Each structure stands twice: as C-alpha cells, then as structure tokens.
Design an enzyme around this catalytic site. Sequence first.
Site, mmCIF file in Angstrom:
data_model
loop_
_atom_site.group_PDB
_atom_site.id
_atom_site.type_symbol
_atom_site.label_atom_id
_atom_site.label_comp_id
_atom_site.label_asym_id
_atom_site.label_seq_id
_atom_site.Cartn_x
_atom_site.Cartn_y
_atom_site.Cartn_z
ATOM 1 N N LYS A 153 13.776 -32.499 106.458
ATOM 2 C CA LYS A 153 12.796 -33.628 106.853
ATOM 3 C C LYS A 153 11.455 -33.353 106.426
ATOM 4 C CE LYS A 153 10.420 -34.216 110.545
ATOM 5 N NZ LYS A 153 10.371 -34.018 112.157
ATOM 6 N N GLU A 179 2.948 -32.165 118.914
ATOM 7 C CA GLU A 179 3.718 -31.207 118.052
ATOM 8 C C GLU A 179 3.358 -29.631 118.705
ATOM 9 O OE1 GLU A 179 6.320 -31.779 116.404
ATOM 10 O OE2 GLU A 179 6.428 -30.595 114.363
ATOM 11 N N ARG A 180 4.621 -29.039 118.707
ATOM 12 C CA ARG A 180 4.516 -27.846 118.714
ATOM 13 C C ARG A 180 3.528 -27.011 117.756
ATOM 14 N NH1 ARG A 180 9.916 -29.632 118.343
ATOM 15 N NH2 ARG A 180 11.176 -28.978 120.184
#
Lengths: 538, 71
Positions: A153, A179-180
């Site tokens: 991705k 997001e992490r």
Amino acid sequence: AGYVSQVIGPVVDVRFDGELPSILSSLEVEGHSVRLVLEVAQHMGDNTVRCIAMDSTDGLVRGQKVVDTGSPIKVPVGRGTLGRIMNVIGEPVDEQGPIDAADIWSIHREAPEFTEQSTEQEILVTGIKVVDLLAPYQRGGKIGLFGGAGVGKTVLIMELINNVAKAHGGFSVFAGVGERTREGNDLYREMIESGVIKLGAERGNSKCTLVYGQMNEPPGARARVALTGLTVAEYFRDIEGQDVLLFVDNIFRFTQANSEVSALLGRIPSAVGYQPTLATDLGGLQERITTTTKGSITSVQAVYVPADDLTDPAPATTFAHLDATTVLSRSIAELGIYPAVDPLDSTSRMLNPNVIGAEHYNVARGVQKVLQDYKNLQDIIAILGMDELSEEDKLTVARARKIQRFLSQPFQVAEVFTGTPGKYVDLADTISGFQGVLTGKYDDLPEMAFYMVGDIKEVKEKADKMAKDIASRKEADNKKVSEELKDIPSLDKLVSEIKEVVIEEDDGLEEDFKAEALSSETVVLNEEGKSVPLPKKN
Amino acid sequence: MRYTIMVSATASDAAPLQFLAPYSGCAMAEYFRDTGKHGLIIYDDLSKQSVAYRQMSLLLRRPPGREAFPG
C-alpha cells in the site's frame, strides 16, 4: 481576555467577560508547558464557551488566561510546506526548523459553492495499468483504498504521489489521521529514500506534505488533522491551481475521532454509537474535496470496515462519497503481482461508457469478464484436472493468465530497492495494449513475458529476450564442485570463528543518574502556597 | 526479579489506583528506554484497567458512550 472555567478531561470551558469567540475559533492558553490550543465548540451561555483541546489538559488551572486568536486554527500553506511534517495546529514536528509559510489559512472553510463546481466528469490518469483500466480515478473524486499490511500500500501511495506530480504537475498532501507513530515514521523514511520527500537544501523538490495527527493525541487533535490536510491541499487547488492528491490515511479514524469529541461534548450517540452528526462530520470534510474551476483535489482515502460489516454506519456513510474503490489483496500479492489491486473487487463510478467512452469501457468490461470466467473454474481445475475441460475454456485460462500477469507494473519509486525501472503507462497504451490480449494477437507469447512491463511494445521485447536465452545457456555447464570440503570447514573449526563478546556482570545502570532522596512524609501546600508537612489531626 | 519490576494494583485497590498503574508502570519502564537500555512492559489485563477507568468516569458523571465507556 478569557479565563479557564472548567477542565473535564479534554473538554475545557473558558469564560470571557467581553465578547465571546466565535464557534470554531482558536484559543491559546497563556502559560503552559506545551502550546495548548483550544477550538471553541459551543457557546454555553453565561459568557462561557466549551472548547475541545488539541493537546493534553493536564496541568491546567481554573482561571488561567486564554487568548482568543480571533480566527479558527490557522496553518501554514504553500510550497514551503512540501516535504515537511506538520501537526494539526501547524507546527513542524519533523525537527527541521520553521515552516516557510506562503500564507496562513484557516482550516475551517465552506465547500466550494455551486457555481464554482465543475459540471464535468473526467479521469485522473495515474500511470498504473490496473487502476487506469479496471477502476479509473475520477479527477476530483474520492477513492477508497482497501489495503492493509504487506500488500504494497505504501509503495502504491508513493507511486500515486510520483505520477501525479510528474504527469499532471500537482502536489500531494498526506493527512495521517490517528496513525501509529511507528507507522508514521515508516512512511516518512520511505518517502525520503524513494525520493518523494527531500531534506535540506533540496526541500523544495519534494512532492508531498505530511500532516500528522498521531494516536496519542487527544480526540480533538485527530478530528481536525484531516482538515489541516484539506487546507494545505486547498491552497494548491485555489491559489496554485493544481490537481492535488490528498491521502486521508484511515478515514475511519476521522469518524472515530469525531465520534469521541461528540461523546465528550455530551451529545447523545446515534445508531450503533457514532455521533449524531456523522453524515455532516464526514460531509463537511468530503465536500471540500472536489473539482473547482481553479484546480482539483482528488482524495485517495483508506477505508477500514469495522467488524467486516459494510452496513455499519461508518463505512456506509463513507461509501456514499466514494467514487472508486481500489481493493488491495494478499492473494494477488502472493502471486508476485504488484500492485496488488484486485481486478474484480476494485470498482469505479467512472467505469461506465458515458464518461470514459465505449472503446475504453468494453476493454475494461471485457478484461473483467475474462478474469471472472477463469476464477469461477478454479474448483473445476483442482477437482477434475487441467487438461480435462474444453480448449476454449483453456483459451480463456491462457488469455486470463497473461492478463492477470499484465496488470503488474514496475514502479518508479520502488526502483531504489528492486532494480527494475519504473513504467508510467499512458491511458491509450493501456487500452490498446489490452484490446490485443483480449482478441488474441499475443496468444503465442508466454505468460511471464507479460510480467512487470510497461506496455505492449515491451511484451514483445521480453518474449524476444527470454526465447533467445536458450541460445545462451549452452555457453557454460552445471554440476557439482568439490562436494563438501571446498570451503566448508569442520564444525570445531567454526567454533573458533566466533568473535569475542564481552559480557559484563555489571549492568551499567547508573550512567547519568540523579538519585533523588524521596521522603515518605506527606508534603502539602499551606494557604501561602508554601510547601509544608501535612497537619496532624483532621 | 533481578531484571523485573512488578507494579501491582490488585482487585481490592481503588479504581483510580488500577487506572494509574499501567501509566506508573510505564514510567518506570520508560526509564530504561530513555537511558539507552531496553524495556519490556506487560500490562496484564489492560481490559481490567479500562473497567477501572469506566468506574471513575461514570461516577464523575462524565457522559458515557458504548458499553458505558467514556469518549
């Protein structure tokens, strides 16, 4: 001019004796360890506004001074933000100095009005074959990306950033919503090595702005960080006049963060548990992503489906806005096909012959038919046999397998670690290349000739080279060399290979250590504010 | 135990004390991260922390969401 009245978690009420700030205005708390920005959510009455904090509210005192900025959250926009990482309130978190702001724009904005809208509907050409044929991207559209981990991705994100910057001349904004931080650092460092983000003096040759709101940020900071990504992409659309890509990484976490700030503001949750304003929390964001007369914003936004339930109200409200889906699959990824776009699962609203034309439509409609008829006979092959079924059903299998190979493509951002150069494939070369495999002009060529190539001018140049290879395998010979004592030592000679590892019984555990003496007396503050022991009796 | 800390907020402890124990265990473990060494933190039943935090929030009359959990 205003002072803190209430602190209940991430929700701060501040009190203005003069004029109140407008709803969605930005407030800065005077005197605090981190810059704390509040965004006004409502006017409560009795000169109080209720605010959602963009940072932690720990250490906040009732009566702290709060300054109204007179405006919503204003972020730096322009070409000076390219290649920078920016948080929700516009500060650089990439540790590379201040952001060269061409302008500072309010992150709150109405969608472009009806006369400003474009009545036309057209393809954003991506240079990826499986995306330009089977699920075309609308210019100004919203695209759901159903990828995951290990389906490539991120290298597909960076290839969209690459090809839109190279062909259409438009920049990109990556809005990482919740997001992490390990994954947001991974995307930053992979953008640096693949060349779409440059550091230092060549910062201006970058193609992507990263706007990050991490998971450890409060729910107000994550709910607005996708609008900070909009505002950077709206400057390129409205001032620079470009065809901008916007990546809202996990639009579900935008929904999830806005659902938390409604729950903290005391609103009654809707069906399954989302905010009552779910369709207008999404529709406020998604309607700024459109085509105007100046330029365009196209949004490739990743979609998480909760509990694998497409009828859940967070994907169902999101899918009303989406103009194409690109499903990345692991089954396509373990066949070596890159990009791992599933050619049947990926859908587009742009795939109908009144907007892409009938010569493009019947190719993509015919290619999908061939791949569908091949994959419903895969419990005919394994059950009965390969040479069992008819020659025409084997003609599809030979045609589908060299279509399923021909949807692969090497990427220009992946060539720094794969060796194979990148191939931007034009739209007419994609249609005309897939007309021929559909009719049968290339049934004589092998299937692995249709593998990781640009177009049909390069499938012939791969079958020529492979076919000859048999002429150049009689050059040398191939058997055994010196069975196992050529350079394979004895095992006890290999124990003396092993290098010295110094193992300390000491831990080295007092490097630079304060070692404060803590006393177990209870220390309080008296009424002077002076630190004092706790008084004896109640 | 010569390498292990144990932060123990047991069942009879107050719900504020079970809410704060993963955070106070993490700060003890963040010492080794911040000084170049390596840490291994284990929050055994992080789902029991959230039950303790839901107890404090419903009792502080904070508005509940799904399964009465806070926002």
